[PDB]
């Protein structure tokens, strides 16, 4: 009975600890991204003697760039990110394990502010889906598909 009186303090303290862990982790894992698209044209010279209706070859590549960062601080989202220690094995008797777990969690969650920095990366991608048509000018029957 005396040991089962534990719920009084262990249940809500653990619940609030998980609450603060969630409210920091959700903001900490933002994974921000930024991207943009353009439709810049690509020109390829066409020899004039080829007698083509169009003088310049035009390509329209889907140009995509994206740069993104992470910005993670110096902390321990690792092993400390564990489910309730009692779980379903409350039958094992202990009093020091819970206090050790709580003080370890407290010191970990206190020691994060020292460092906060991370890396980034950027991409440059092109997509081509250009199906162009050219006519041999003065000869509409003759035609070329690219």
């Amino acid at each position: 009975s005396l040991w089962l009186s534990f719920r009084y303090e262990i249940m809500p303290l653990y619940y609030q600890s998980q609450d603060v862990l969630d409210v920091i982790a959700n903001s900490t894992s933002e994974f921000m991204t930024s991207r943009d698209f353009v439709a810049k044209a690509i020109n390829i010279g066409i020899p004039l003697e080829w007698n083509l209706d169009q003088e310049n070859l035009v390509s329209q590549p889907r140009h995509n760039v994206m740069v993104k960062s992470k910005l993670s601080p110096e902390n321990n989202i690792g092993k400390t990110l564990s489910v309730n220690p009692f779980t379903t094995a409350w039958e094992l008797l202990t009093l020091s394990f819970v206090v050790d777990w709580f003080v370890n969690f407290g010191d970990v969650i206190a020691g994060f502010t020292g460092g906060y920095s991370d890396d980034s990366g950027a991409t440059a991608s092109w997509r081509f889906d250009d199906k162009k048509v050219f006519h041999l000018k003065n000869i509409p029957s003759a035609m070329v598909i690219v």
Binding site: S5, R7, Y8, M11, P12, Y15
Partner: protein, 48 residues
């Protein structure tokens, strides 16, 4: 409750107030878990 528990000195009232705390925070944790699970299904239904 610990305001009264701090200075009671009578075992009967002490144990009765401990029983009151037991029942009250038991109801608190029960309604806590019920609310959490019902909002879990609530979000599932909203997503669906």
């Amino acid at each position: 409750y610990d305001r009264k528990i701090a200075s009671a000195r009578k075992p009967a009232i002490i144990v009765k107030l401990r029983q009151r705390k037991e029942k009250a925070l038991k109801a608190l944790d029960k309604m806590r878990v019920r609310e959490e699970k019902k909002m879990i299904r609530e979000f599932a239904t909203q997503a669906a």
